[PDB]
Amino acid sequence: TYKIGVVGDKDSVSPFRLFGFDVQHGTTKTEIRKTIDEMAKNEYGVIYITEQCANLVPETIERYKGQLTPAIILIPSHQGTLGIGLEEIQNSVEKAVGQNIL
Amino acid sequence: VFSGSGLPHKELAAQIARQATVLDSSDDFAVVFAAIGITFEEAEFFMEDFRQTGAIDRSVMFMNLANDPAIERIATPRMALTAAEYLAYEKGMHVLVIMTDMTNYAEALREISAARREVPGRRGYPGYLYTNLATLFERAGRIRGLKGSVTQIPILTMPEDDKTHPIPDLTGYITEGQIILTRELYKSGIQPPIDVLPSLSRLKDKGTGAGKTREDHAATMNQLFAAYAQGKQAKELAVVLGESALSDIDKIYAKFAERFENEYVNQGFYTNRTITETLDLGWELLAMLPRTELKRIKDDLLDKYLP
Amino acid sequence: LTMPEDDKTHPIPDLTGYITEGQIILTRELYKSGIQPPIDVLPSLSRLKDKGTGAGKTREDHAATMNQLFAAYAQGKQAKELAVVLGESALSDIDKIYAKFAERFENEYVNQGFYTNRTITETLDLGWELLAMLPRTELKRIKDDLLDKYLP
Amino acid sequence: GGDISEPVTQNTLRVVKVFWGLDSSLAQKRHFPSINWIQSYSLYSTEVGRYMDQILQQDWSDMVTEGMRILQEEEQLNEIVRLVGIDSLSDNDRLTLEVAKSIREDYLQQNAFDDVDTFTSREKQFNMLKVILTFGKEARKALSLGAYFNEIMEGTVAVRERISRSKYIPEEELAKISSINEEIKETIQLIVS
Amino acid sequence: GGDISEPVTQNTLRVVKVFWGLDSSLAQKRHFPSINWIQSYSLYSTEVGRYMDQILQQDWSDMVTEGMRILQEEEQLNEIVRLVGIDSLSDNDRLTLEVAKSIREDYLQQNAFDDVDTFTSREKQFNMLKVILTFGKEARKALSLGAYFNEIMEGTVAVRERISRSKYIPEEELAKISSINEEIKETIQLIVS
Amino acid sequence: GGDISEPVTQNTLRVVKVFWGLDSSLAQKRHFPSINWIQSYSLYSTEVGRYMDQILQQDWSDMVTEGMRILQEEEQLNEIVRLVGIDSLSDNDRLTLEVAKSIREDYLQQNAFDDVDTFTSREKQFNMLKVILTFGKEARKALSLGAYFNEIMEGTVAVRERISRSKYIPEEELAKISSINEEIKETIQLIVS
Amino acid sequence: NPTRMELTRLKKQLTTATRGHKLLKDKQDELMRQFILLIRKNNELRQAIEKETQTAMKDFVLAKSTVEEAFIDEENVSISVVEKNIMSVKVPLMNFQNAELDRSIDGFTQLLPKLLKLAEVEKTCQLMAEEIEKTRRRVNALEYMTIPQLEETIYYIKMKLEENERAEVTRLIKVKNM
């Protein structure tokens, strides 16, 4: 039974620690760098990250995507998503089906 | 014409034989048709169609059947070209020589070669196959100071659809172009099933342009060919990585190439298109393309012909 | 005859097959696996077998079970190959049976030993024990006039 | 060009009873003797097998047949893996490949220039082959008891080395090979935990 | 070779116009005569077509061409079936599947040891091909008229079997076959309801 | 058949040091001269390389080597694109394809029937190649600065195109070709911001 | 290499590759159709939870607004991941084992069960996608590279073989003459 980590705004993702979610922060790509490696190498199961922070480092979601754990999941902020999470799903379709099934 | 077994090259032959003409000339054109080692029924097809359309009235036919002696087979195109050059250089005529099947000719030559204990060359054919073929195909051409000419369209079937086979390969080294028929187009009902991509005519420039054809012959050709290439390669992309891997500009080339085949190439074995009709249809297909991508054609031609 | 280079296209096995009514074929693949006699029934042929079979010569289920065993053995090899190309998971429960069938067909039916003499009764009843692996559903190349009588 | 289709080899194979087919691939892999164990044969195998069974009082013929069966099954597995890859092979077939790899590398390959490996006695051959097949059979049973292939390999690194360096064991200390059978069974069942 | 790339076969097909490809696969499915309708051809088809239309006063060439099209589509559709499943496909295509089935079983298949089936006259052939095709698109407009594919089938259990046994109807009582055509339309009409 | 294993080609390639392998697929793709840059070779390349470096007083042999390296790397990448698709390639490898494409389309291809393109002087050759290579170097160092392939590509339509017509630039007006080097560098810069 | 022995060998590899190409292509087909269903599930599962999570965070901001916030400066949650199979692929299974302030914190608990389901489904969709591409690669590697290699390596050998047969027979005719 391994841990869950969070990355996003402290105005956003702060009440997740009330559960016991390791909830850390960053702005540029280089702090989300390590937060994810910190959590991935510590054998975490799921990592929730706001698209505003995850946009910084698309580097990351794709390295860890083909792996069982952790599960890097794009969540939003107060004002919401950029749309990354839905087109990552959308792009998956157009290359595995060759047609949009939506 | 590089064809294959089961491919309608006999239909195309007859179609060329009766539709072929020189513009602005009256009764100075003739067709010499040579049939090599073909079956009885296949010979009757040609002979009847010739006299049915009246094409016999301007033609000379040398018919050699499959059950005829192999020496009579290898002699047939020589008989034809002799009558052809006679009409051309000594009577001043524009003669079009159509010969089929050249694969049957080569096999006959291979049979004689074996009968004379001769040393078998590549793939069993005579070492002198190239030279022997050259003594035939080089009989075509024009002479300085003489009215008339000998124009040859040899027709052959590529064994196993193999272009590297001695018969198409050596022919290709001798002749100037090649018209290729493919099973992909024939199974799609394209008549005639001509694939313009591997097909070529080396001298085409000497028979095109204003005064011969319209002034837009060269540009539209380059344009149609380049576009049909993209369309074909857009289609081969849609089958591999799906239809979502195609950009919007590649929507169009795909649809272009389809119309190009079903409307432009596919005309039917009994539709005689004049060159002015052909060129006109060419512009119509370019019309479905955005003008800003027609960079082979200059603005002067676009402003005059593009609808 | 011994086919040079184990090549069936060689003049000697090629011309002989033209004159003779079929052929029995021994493969190195079966030999190497301990199957003796290493007879590969799939390229093997007897062009006159339909004359020496049936009631009064053999039992009525001869020609019938022959066809079924031949079919199931081919489906067995296809199944075994499937479990390698795609894997364990792609196998149907009917596929795993066909695989197990061909394995038993080789090691129990074909592999009898060069000193084992089987009466055609013992052979036919053996071929039925092997078909018993398969659900009655699969044996569709036999009549069930015959099937209800001999199926284990 | 190693083309055995030629008359000399062909005429020779019609009268000889033993065919030791050498292969370029093995030779260029330093697999010596470079004997193609799929093309090679001996019409004496059955008779020698009876002799060996009597002399050793062991089921030797079974081991050779099983040894050759595994080597054949590897050949039938390789010809598929060559063009579809390693990915979909079930635990049973990878175990087969690992046993056949052991037969190849730990038993078939033999250095003529080595002092110990240049010659192997009849009783040393039996022990080496016994050990290799024993690992396969005991790891086969483990696989049947819910154990995973990679768990078995992970825990048999030590005992499989003894199998690899079994060929270099001196002729007077053959007990250092028979004991491997005990460790194999001992280590394998500990993996089922 | 058993395969027809052979020289004598190729040289034959050079000077002959007809090729009946006997299929050992079809005979294993009890499909007699086991002539493969995809690999077979006849360059006389068109000319014979004219002769037929002339002497029968019918559009026979059109029916044959359509009959072949159904068989052609069946090969492409069977491909889509084993890959996706029969439940997951269009009613139109599954109608084509049952018409192709009909052409195969009720028309193509033929016993040489049956008094009536061993010969089928030119007139009888027309009538038998008619009812099979007549069922086809009579059924199709039911579909296009808001009816469901399945329902048509239980409605036509009686008449489909009457089509299935057109082959067994004597030459004299030939009208018994053409009277199936009207039964089809009326049946479908009632099924549309 | 284009097969160069034949005696005359092989006997000629034994004594001559330059092999211009003409390709049919290039001919069909309207790629003239249809000289296969992968297969063709010149054993004078090293010596000419020194002659060039001395007469031009520039690192020409280094330029030719790099351009040729890009072309061979292109052929390796095209294999991968054929297998996994172009989308999977890193932005560095995607850049390589575009630089090579420019080498093929803007340099290797040459129309013998264009009054300007039919001949290209030694210094014009140099200026053209320097420009094309400069684009690659400026872009590749831009990627290390965190720039993406798509922005660099879409923000250089004007200047990459300018390279495409450089072949049609008159010999007198050479400056118009070498002036692109500064334009490329400054166009890249505004993309880096 | 143009021996008779390798021709017969390669000929069988062609059949093996042909069947292998088949099976891998039907597998790829069946993988995407299973992927079809799962990806549609993943899509509207995300679209839903994206609105719920965002709205939850916006209500918290209003609660956080009135606080300084020194007040929010101020359970051992964790998942158990057991490995399922969807066809060929390994797939994760995951389950969990002041007034308007806590209205927003009661406002972050609802998300957890649907957030974990999203993680489970989305990761599954990713793992299936990778298996498709791995399978696609091998289909392509076999169809474009391996089979055509075999196909006219064969063609080359058969014609080299017939080239030599015809060469040898021409030799023997001369030897008989001498």
Fold assignment, D43-193 = 1.10.1140
By DSSP bridging, strand D18-19 and strand C45-46 are unpaired
Q: Please count the other Cβ atoms lying within 10 Å of the Cβ belonging to residue D31.
A: 17
Report chain E residues whose CB lies below 8 A from the CB of G26. 83
Are the C-beta atoms of residues B127 and B73 closer than 8 Å to each other? no
Q: What are phi and psi of C81, to 5 degrees?
A: -75, -35
Report the candidate in D89, D72, D90 with the shortest Cα–Cα distance to residue D36. D72
Report chain D residues whose CB lies below 8 A from the CB of G4. 5
d(Cα F3, Cα E179) in Å, to the nearest integer? 67
H or E, element range at F109: none
Q: What are phi and psi of E34, to 5 degrees?
A: -75, 60
Tokens of F39: 């297969």
Q: What's the full length of chain E, in residues?
A: 193
User: What one-letter code names the amino acid at F125?
Assistant: Q
Upstream peptide bond of E33 is cis (omega within 30 degrees of 0): yes
d(Cα D53, Cα D47) in Å, to the nearest integer? 10
Give me the helix-helix angle, E60-84 and E45-56, nearest 10°.
Answer: 130
Taking the CA of residue G142 and the nearest CA in chain A, the distance in Å comes to: 19
Are the C-beta atoms of residues C33 and C4 closer than 8 Å to each other? no
Q: What's the full length of chain A, in residues?
A: 102
Report the candidate in B67, F103, B180, G3 with the shortest Cα–Cα distance to residue D1. G3
Report the candidate in C83, C68, C77, C63 with the shortest Cα–Cα distance to residue C30. C77
Q: Please count the other Cβ atoms lying within 10 Å of the Cβ belonging to residue F165.
A: 12
Q: How many contacts does F have with G, using Cβ atoms within 8 A?
A: 13
Report, in angstroms and rounded to the nearest whole number, the Rg of chain F calculated over CA atoms.
18
Report chain C residues whose CB lies below 8 A from the CB of E28. 67, 71, 141
Q: What are phi and psi of F74, to 5 degrees?
A: -65, -45
The DSSP call for residue E19 is E
d(Cα B101, Cα A68) in Å, to the nearest integer? 65
Residue B148's region, left for phi above 0, alpha for psi from -120 to 50, else beta, is left
Q: What is the CATH number of the domain that holds A57?
A: 3.40.50.10580
Q: Is A96 exposed, middle or buried (0-12, 13-18, 19+ CB in 10 A)?
A: buried
Extended strands (E) in F24-175: 41-42
Name residues whose C-beta falls within 8 Å of residue F147's C-beta, 6 or more positions apart in sequence: F191, F192
Task: Name the neighbours of A, counting chains with at least 3 Cβ pairs within 8 A.
Answer: B, G
H or E, element range at E118: none
Q: Please count the other Cβ atoms lying within 10 Å of the Cβ belonging to residue D62.
A: 14
Q: Residue ranges of the alpha helices (H) in chain A?
A: 29-40, 51-54, 58-63, 84-96
By DSSP bridging, strand D41-42 and strand D18-19 are antiparallel
Are the C-beta atoms of residues D61 and D50 closer than 8 Å to each other? yes
Domain count, chain A: 1
**Local structure of A4: helix, strand or coil:** strand
Q: What are phi and psi of A80, to 5 degrees?
A: 115, -155
**Local structure of E90: helix, strand or coil:** coil
Q: How many contacts does B have with E, using Cβ atoms within 8 A?
A: 7
Task: Name the neighbours of E, counting chains with at least 3 Cβ pairs within 8 A.
Answer: B, C, G
**Local structure of G85: helix, strand or coil:** strand
User: What one-letter code names the amino acid at D142?
Assistant: A
Are the C-beta atoms of residues B287 and B306 closer than 8 Å to each other? yes
Q: How far is CA B96 from the centre of its chain?
A: 12
Report the candidate in A43, A35, A75, A82 with the shortest Cα–Cα distance to residue A59. A35
Give me the resolution in angstroms, 1 decimal.
Answer: 2.9
d(Cα G175, Cα E53) in Å, to the nearest integer? 65
d(Cα B86, Cα B88) in Å, to the nearest integer? 5
d(Cα G88, Cα D85) in Å, to the nearest integer? 15
d(Cα F107, Cα F45) in Å, to the nearest integer? 18
Upstream peptide bond of B192 is cis (omega within 30 degrees of 0): yes
Q: Please count the other Cβ atoms lying within 10 Å of the Cβ belonging to residue A54.
A: 26
d(Cα D56, Cα G153) in Å, to the nearest integer? 50
H or E, element range at E104: none
Are the C-beta atoms of residues B94 and B148 closer than 8 Å to each other? yes
CA angle F12, F18, F23 (to 5 degrees): 85
By DSSP bridging, strand A4-7 and strand A22-24 are parallel
Are the C-beta atoms of residues G91 and G84 closer than 8 Å to each other? yes
* Solved with: X-ray
Q: What is the 3-state secondary structure (H, E, C) of chain B?
A: CEECCCCCHHHHHHHHHHHCCCCCCCCCEEEEEEEEEECHHHHHHHHHHHHHHCHHHHEEEEEEECCCCHHHHHHHHHHHHHHHHHHHHCCCCEEEEEEECHHHHHHHHHHHHHHCCCCECHHHCECCHHHHHHHHHCCCECCCCCCCEEEEEECEECHHHCCCCHHHHHHHHHCCCECEECHHHHCCCCCCCECCCCCECCCHHHHCCECCECCCHHHHHHHHHHHHHHHHHHHHHHCCCCHHHCCCHHHHHHHHHHHHHHHHHCCCCCCCCCHHHHHHHHHHHHCCCCHHHCCCCCHHHHHHHCC
3-state helix, strand, coil split of chain F in percent (to 5) is 65, 5, 30
The residue range of the domain holding A28 is 1-102
Are the C-beta atoms of residues B110 and B124 closer than 8 Å to each other? yes
**Local structure of C22: helix, strand or coil:** strand
d(Cα E131, Cα E150) in Å, to the nearest integer? 20
- The residue with tokens 């760098």 is A33
Are the C-beta atoms of residues B36 and B69 closer than 8 Å to each other? no
H or E, element range at G86: strand G79-86
CA angle G87, G90, G93 (to 5 degrees): 110
- Breaks in chain C after residues (C–N exceeding 2.5 Å): none
H or E, element range at C105: none
The residues facing E42 across adjacent strands are E18
E13 CB near a chain B CB, below 8 Å?
Answer: yes
d(Cα D54, Cα D36) in Å, to the nearest integer? 28
Are the C-beta atoms of residues B167 and B154 closer than 8 Å to each other? no
Q: Which long-range contacts (CB under 8 A, 24 or more apart) does F72-81 make?
A: F72/F38, F73/F100, F74/F100, F74/F101, F75/F38, F79/G145
By DSSP bridging, strand E18-19 and strand D18-19 are unpaired
**Local structure of D19: helix, strand or coil:** strand
User: What one-letter code names the amino acid at C22?
Assistant: G
Q: Write the CA distances from A74 to A24, B175, G96, integer angstroms.
A: 15, 65, 19
Between the two ends of chain C, the Cα-to-Cα distance in Å is 39
The residues facing B94 across adjacent strands are B29, B149
Report the candidate in B102, B46, B36 with the shortest Cα–Cα distance to residue B71. B36
Upstream peptide bond of A70 is cis (omega within 30 degrees of 0): yes
* Physical contact, D and A (3 or more Cβ pairs within 8 A): no
Report the candidate in C28, B32, G144 with the shortest Cα–Cα distance to residue D19. C28
Tokens of A14: 């702060």
Report chain G residues whose CB lies below 8 A from the CB of B165. none
**Local structure of D94: helix, strand or coil:** helix
Strand order in the sheet with B59-65: B59-65, B29-38, B94-100, B149-154
Between the two ends of chain F, the Cα-to-Cα distance in Å is 55
Tokens of A52: 């505003």
- The residue with tokens 């006259």 is E121
Q: Is D84 exposed, middle or buried (0-12, 13-18, 19+ CB in 10 A)?
A: buried
Report chain G residues whose CB lies below 8 A from the CB of F83. 137, 140-141, 144-145
Between the two ends of chain G, the Cα-to-Cα distance in Å is 33
G35 CB near a chain A CB, below 8 Å?
Answer: yes
Q: What is the CATH number of domain B1-307?
A: 3.40.50.12240
Q: What's the full length of chain F, in residues?
A: 193
Q: How far is CA D84 from the centre of its chain?
A: 25
Residue B117's region, left for phi above 0, alpha for psi from -120 to 50, else beta, is left
The DSSP call for residue A10 is T
Cα dihedral F54, F56, F62, F67 in deg (nearest 10): -140
Tell if the CB–CB gap between F83 and G144 is shorter than 8 Å. yes
Are the C-beta atoms of residues G2 and G167 closer than 8 Å to each other? no
- Within 39-98 of A, beta carbons closer than 8 Å to B belong to 93-95, 97-98
d(Cα A68, Cα B18) in Å, to the nearest integer? 71
By DSSP bridging, strand A4-7 and strand B149-154 are unpaired
Q: Write the CA distances from B199 to B179, B213, B267, integer angstroms.
A: 5, 20, 18
Are the C-beta atoms of residues F118 and F111 closer than 8 Å to each other? yes
Q: Please count the other Cβ atoms lying within 10 Å of the Cβ belonging to residue B88.
A: 28
d(Cα F134, Cα F54) in Å, to the nearest integer? 21
Report chain G residues whose CB lies below 8 A from the CB of F79. 145
The DSSP call for residue D103 is I
d(Cα C134, Cα C70) in Å, to the nearest integer? 14
